[PDB]
Amino acid sequence: ERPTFYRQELNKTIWEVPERYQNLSPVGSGAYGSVCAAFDTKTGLRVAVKKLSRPFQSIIHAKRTYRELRLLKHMKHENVIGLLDVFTPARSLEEFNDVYLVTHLMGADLNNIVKCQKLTDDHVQFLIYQILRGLKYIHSADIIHRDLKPSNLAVNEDCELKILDFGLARHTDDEMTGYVATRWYRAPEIMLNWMHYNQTVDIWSVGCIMAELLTGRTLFPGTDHIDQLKLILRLVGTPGAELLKKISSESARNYIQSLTQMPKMNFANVFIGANPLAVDLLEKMLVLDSDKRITAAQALAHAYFAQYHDPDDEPVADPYDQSFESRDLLIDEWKSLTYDEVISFVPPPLD
Numbered sequence: 001e002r003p004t005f006y007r008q009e010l011n012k013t014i015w016e017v018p019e020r021y022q023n024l025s026p027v028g029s030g031a032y033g034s035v036c037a038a039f040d041t042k043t044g045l046r047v048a049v050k051k052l053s054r055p056f057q058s059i060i061h062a063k064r065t066y067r068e069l070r071l072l073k074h075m076k077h078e079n080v081i082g083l084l085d086v087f088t089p090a091r092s093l094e095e096f097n098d099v100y101l102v103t104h105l106m107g108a109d110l111n112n113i114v115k116c117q118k119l120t121d122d123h124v125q126f127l128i129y130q131i132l133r134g135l136k137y138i139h140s141a142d143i144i145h146r147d148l149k150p151s152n153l154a155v156n157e158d159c160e161l162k163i164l165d166f167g168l169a170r171h172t173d174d175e176m177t178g179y180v181a182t183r184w185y186r187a188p189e190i191m192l193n194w195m196h197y198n199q200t201v202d203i204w205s206v207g208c209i210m211a212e213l214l215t216g217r218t219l220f221p222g223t224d225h226i227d228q229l230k231l232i233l234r235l236v237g238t239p240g241a242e243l244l245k246k247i248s249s250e251s252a253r254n255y256i257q258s259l260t261q262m263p264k265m266n267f268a269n270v271f272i273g274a275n276p277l278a279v280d281l282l283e284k285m286l287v288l289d290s291d292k293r294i295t296a297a298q299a300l301a302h303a304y305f306a307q308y309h310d311p312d313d314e315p316v317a318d319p320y321d322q323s324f325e326s327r328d329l330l331i332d333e334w335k336s337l338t339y340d341e342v343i344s345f346v347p348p349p350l351d
């Protein structure tokens with residue numbers, strides 16, 4: 001019942017995969033993993049296979065591996081990445097050292113859509129509706145993406161959209177420094193570590209994405225953390241005392257207060273010619289105080305999506321047990337938990 005595996009070297013990386021996966025071709029790599037495109041002869045699908053890099057090298061990495069697998073096994077929604085397969089060449093826990101994760105091959109992301117074609121208001125409605133529909137689902141499981149951006153959004157030729165995470169490297173300060181798309185979609189509270197963050201950090205990102213779909217241009221293309229903050233506060237206004245009290249960081253709070261006070265701008269004069277309903281929704285998403293931001297579930301009911309909104313086809317997630325997050329284990333323990341989840345994996349209905 002165990003499939004036969006075959007070996008192949010690709011860019012100095014050994015790939016051992018079941019025979020069903022053919023025509024492996026490098027797509028990308030980083031500190032956390034390497035990715036190949038392939039043809040799944042069992043399902044007839046073009047797939048992307050991610051091989052994790054040293055998944056159990058440390059406690060921190062071992063835990064991250066377990067977390068990703070748990071997440072991936074749980075997410076079953078049209079607008080979210082689906083796990084087609086997870087495998088290891090290991091025949092036992094003792095020799096278990098590699099984990100491979102398989103999903104549908106992307107190809108086009110939202111970045112190349114917005115860079116390479118004209119989008120009507122109808123397109124924007126459909127794209128953002130799908131992101132919000134996925135977010136409702138993940139947020140109902142108390143799962144937060146935190147790194148929503150055009151390159152993490154797969155879009156097909158019928159404009160159908162899926163949320164994933166193509167991060168293959170450590171989320172360091174260097175990667176977040178300077179004039180980088182890495183930071184342009186980030187909620188200010190997480191960019192400047194103001195406070196404990198809520199799931200509406202993802203709604204801020206959606207606002208930034210929606211704005212760029214409407215104008216074709218990045219909303220807050222800051223040259224660094226502080227330049228980006230100034231771009232944000234110019235649009236949305238400097239915070240009042242109510243928000244300032246919620247900023248737990250004394251240093252961050254003290255910095256914001258050094259800034260000259262500015263009013264919220266008129267969004268109709270920024271997003272010129274945009275559907276007034278799109279302008280209205282942007283104003284409800286691009287709110288500095290994360291307590292006051294519209295939720296995904298609230299947003300799906302906004303009049304901007306009247307064309308697509310169907311309350312009987314916007315599903316929530318099954319309960320997701322994240323007790324493991326608070327738990328301290330050894331590498332070998334995280335490894336055994338991970339091994340059990342590989343072994344217990346049941347493929348989605350064919351296909």
Ligand SMILES: O=C(Nc1ccc2[nH]cc(CCc3ccncc3)c2c1)c1cc(F)cc(N2CCOCC2)c1
Binds near residue numbers: 027035080105107144
């Ligand atoms: O996308 C994720 N993982 C994943 C799994 C299997 C994969 N195979 C290949 C890749 C690289 C990306 C890719 C996919 C398809 N074609 C080309 C490249 C890969 C990645 C992923 C990881 C996470 F930790 C969270 C989320 N969540 C997503 C939902 O919102 C909550 C976070 C998604």
